[PDB]
């Protein structure tokens, strides 16, 4: 079957990959040995299993994932992780090149080295798969490299893939604060190029997720990683649901395609709900209704937003497991009340709502108490736009500053191209806003 192995760029991206992979690993229940303490999965590795990782050493479930370590540090991370142990060293690839990176510089220089290696790996995997619609990969915006990889990588892969698009994951700084100036530098250039290539984009609010975890855990820190775990969990959940058999299973791409009537919003927003504190679970089990309320409430949604403030051209929430009747019943009413939701002009139809046959699953080792339902929602969010505006504001300021010309110059990347990217981003955002308004 089709198998997607994520490619994670940047320390964060890799870290995410580690978490996500590990989370998968936990789900697999297969030891780092690669032989699962569990019995062989049904159908050997499941289609999902194969999809995430091609199965080799059959009778043993050994995940295969491609990681690039621009920094040797990543390699250490990879090696440190159990997954690497399962992974044949072939699977792991480390760039000789340093990250280094200047954001502009890194992607071009690094990408070339990676691409050849990755492509081979990809092709083999593709060969392994009956066919690969596309790859879902995680990249870090903040790192120059991470952002850089996506742009360069995406195009090539897109070409190879042809019509079938790839799903892209990105790291989106919360508009509130940016990790570094550099990231927003990456953002516009990466985003504009990437967006066209990518069918969709995944947006995460680094701060927001941290905040969300922060509230429930009621520990802001430590740990960041814990926050990461949730992020891994949420991402894992959505994929997991698709992976899991469903009475109705929709491919994510199809769903996202459904989500946006227009390519204009390539990237659905990602949300997780309900968020549940462990303690809350202790107090009581979450009700379906509570789930419903939680999902809607902006705190739950990964990005903090005012639902009025944001507009949802379309909002859908994929649910893991089985959607309860309740959940479903409750939903229409919610949608109904919610002014905030926007409309498409044309037709009211074209959506799908969708349930997975498999019962709700909880990711093992979940820091938080398990939630009966973990859900994601794809929608258009103001926050991304606002973040865009915020980035734009900074960017324009940067433009006025003409600061960090040198970094780009070192890349040899055009300032004009950069400005163009900014313009394009503005165009995209403006167009997106324009389309967003009915």
């Amino acid at each position: 079957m089709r198998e997607c192995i994520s490619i994670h760029v940047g320390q964060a991206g890799v870290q995410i990959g580690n978490a996500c992979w590990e989370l998968y690993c936990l789900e697999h229940g297969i030891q780092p040995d690669g032989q699962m303490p569990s019995d062989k999965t049904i159908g050997g590795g499941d289609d999902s299993f194969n999809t995430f990782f091609s199965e080799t050493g059959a009778g043993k479930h050994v995940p295969r994932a491609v990681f690039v370590d621009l920094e040797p540090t990543v390699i250490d991370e990879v090696r440190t992780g159990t997954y690497r142990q399962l992974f044949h060293p072939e699977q792991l690839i480390t760039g000789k090149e340093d990250a280094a990176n200047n954001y502009a510089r890194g992607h071009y220089t690094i990408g070339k080295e990676i691409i050849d290696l990755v492509l081979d790996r990809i092709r083999k995997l593709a060969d392994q798969c009956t066919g690969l619609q596309g790859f879902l990969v995680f990249h870090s915006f903040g790192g120059g490299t991470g952002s850089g990889f996506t742009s360069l990588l995406m195009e090539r892969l897109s070409v190879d893939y042809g019509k079938k698009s790839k799903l892209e994951f990105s790291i989106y700084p919360a508009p509130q604060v940016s990790t570094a100036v550099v990231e927003p530098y990456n953002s516009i250039l990466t985003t504009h190029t990437t967006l066209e290539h990518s069918d969709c984009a995944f947006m995460v609010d680094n701060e927001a997720i941290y905040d969300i975890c922060r509230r429930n855990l009621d520990i802001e820190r430590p740990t960041y990683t814990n926050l990461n775990r949730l992020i891994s969990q949420i991402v894992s959940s959505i994929t997991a649901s698709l992976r899991f058999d469903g009475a109705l299973n929709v491919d994510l791409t199809e769903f996202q395609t459904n989500l946006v009537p227009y390519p204009r919003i390539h990237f659905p927003l990602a949300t997780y709900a309900p968020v549940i504190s462990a303690e809350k679970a202790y107090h009581e089990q979450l009700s379906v209704a509570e789930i419903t309320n939680a999902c809607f409430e902006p705190a739950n949604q990964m990005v903090k937003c005012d639902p009025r403030h944001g507009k949802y051209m379309a909002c859908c929430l994929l649910y893991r497991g089985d959607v309860v009747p309740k959940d479903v019943n409750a939903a229409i009413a919610t949608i109904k009340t919610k002014r905030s939701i926007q409309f498409v002009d044309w037709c009211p139809t074209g959506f799908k709502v969708g349930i997975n046959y498999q019962p709700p699953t909880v990711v093992p080792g979940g820091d938080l108490a398990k939630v009966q339902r973990a859900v994601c929602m794809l929608s258009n969010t103001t926050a991304i736009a606002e973040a865009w505006a915020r980035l734009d504001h900074k960017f324009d300021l940067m433009y006025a500053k003409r600061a960090f010309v040198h970094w780009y110059v070192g890349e040899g990347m055009e300032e004009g191209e950069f400005s163009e990217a900014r313009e394009d981003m503005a165009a995209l955002e403006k167009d997106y806003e324009e389309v967003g308004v009915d």
Binding site: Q11, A100, T179, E207, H406
Partner: protein
């Protein structure tokens, strides 16, 4: 790998460098045995990258010592891990600078170069590319700087990959016995600024204040002062060397900190800094350290941090970092000064955290970004120079050096231009 050998120039460079080596070696924690104190293999690996292995997995330093006089070399060798360091790396020059910028520069450079190539090769062996070399010298010593400058210029030229960063103590403008001493400084300053895109200096005053309070010694202990100073420097390198949950490129950061290559100046920050008793008795809270870095007293350099603003702000984190702390940091920066953050770019400060908190106190911080005061400090320094010009001191030396008197003027002009621009920008939003 990409280990960078540190080269010291000038009398100060030599003296500091020895401490630097000691600090670094201490950081390595590699005994003369060559066993690795650090449990982590990787940490050992980094050290291993840093220093070639003597048998017993000893690590031998890669660096060149500047020999103002051969005694200094003797000193280091005499000093601990004399065995650890191997004299082959050592370069010798009895003459030393000769306290002639030109003379020392010219004479030393030839000697240095050969060692330089050899040492460079070793590093190249270690890692194909190195980010760049950081050399410590005394800016104030004209000769010390001058000797250093040549290597730095050449090296950077040799490898664009490497970025030249220098540490030199600035004579504090606060006191000058005579104009002439700063005269050396001005020459060094002019050369240095051109030489390195980014340069780092510590004010003498900063040393004086820090040393004086801490030591309470009438006169600063060179070793003691060097120890503290080295430690802070060690922290930055250590942080970069050591893995972090998020790691930031030192170079990338360096590029980041200055909006442009133009601003050589960087403002170091070390922490925790407290009185000896204070530190021992109590441990700072994480946010406390952050605040501490803000405070002038904590920062090695002396300034009125409130008065000064940061064109760019950055923070480095060690130990576990709170997400909240980050927010606190962001908030605090805004709180303390609007000027603190650049108007141009919001939330300039970005921090990277080491995975493992530094040896000693888990929490460590460095100060990033530059302050108005330092920039003023430069301006102040030039002030001495002008007086020096009025003196036309070192007229004889200048003649002997063959260095242009006009060159001095040029240095003043150039420094003036840069300082003016810097100050103007710094003043400017």
């Amino acid at each position: 790998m990409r280990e960078i050998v540190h080269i010291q120039a000038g009398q100060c460079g030599n003296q500091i460098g020895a401490k630097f080596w000691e600090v670094i070696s201490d950081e390595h924690g590699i005994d003369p045995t060559g066993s690795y104190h650090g449990d982590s293999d990787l940490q050992l690996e980094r050290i291993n990258v840093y220093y070639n292995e003597a048998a017993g997995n000893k690590y031998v330093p890669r660096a060149i010592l500047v020999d103002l006089e051969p005694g200094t070399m003797d000193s280091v060798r005499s000093g601990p891990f004399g065995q650890i360091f191997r004299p082959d790396n050592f370069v010798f020059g009895q003459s030393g600078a000769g306290n002639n910028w030109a003379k020392g520069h010219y004479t030393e450079g030839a000697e240095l170069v050969d060692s330089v190539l050899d040492v460079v090769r070793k590093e190249s062996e270690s890692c194909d590319c190195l980010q760049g070399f950081q050399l410590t010298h005394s800016l104030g010593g004209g000769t010390g700087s001058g000797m250093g400058t040549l290597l730095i210029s050449k090296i950077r030229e040799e490898y664009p990959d490497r970025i030249m960063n220098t540490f030199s103590v600035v004579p504090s403008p606060k006191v000058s016995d005579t104009v002439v001493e700063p005269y050396n400084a001005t020459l060094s300053v002019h050369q240095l600024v051109e030489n390195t895109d980014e340069t780092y200096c510590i004010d003498n005053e900063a040393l004086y204040d820090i040393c004086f309070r801490t030591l309470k010694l009438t006169t600063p202990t060179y070793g003691d002062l060097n120890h503290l100073v080295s430690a802070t420097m060690s922290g930055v390198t250590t942080c970069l060397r050591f893995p972090g949950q998020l790691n930031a490129d030192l170079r990338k950061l360096a590029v980041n900190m200055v909006p442009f290559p133009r601003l050589h100046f960087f403002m170091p920050g070390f922490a925790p800094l407290t009185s000896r008793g204070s530190q021992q008795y109590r441990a700072l809270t994480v946010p406390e350290l952050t605040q501490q870095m803000f405070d002038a007293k904590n920062m090695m350099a002396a300034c009125d941090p409130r008065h000064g603003r940061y064109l760019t702000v950055a923070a480095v984190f060690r130990g576990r970092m709170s997400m909240k702390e980050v927010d606190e940091q962001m908030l605090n920066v805004q709180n303390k000064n609007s000027s603190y953050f650049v108007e141009w770019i919001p939330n300039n400060v970005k921090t990277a955290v080491c995975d493992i908190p530094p040896r000693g106190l888990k929490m460590s911080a460095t100060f990033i970004g530059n302050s108005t005061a330092i920039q003023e400090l430069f301006k102040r320094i030039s002030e001495q120079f002008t007086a020096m010009f009025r003196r036309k001191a070192f007229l004889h030396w200048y003649t002997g050096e063959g260095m242009d008197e006009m060159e001095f003027t040029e240095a003043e002009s150039n420094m003036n231009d840069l300082v003016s621009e810097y100050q103007q920008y710094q003043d400017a939003t």
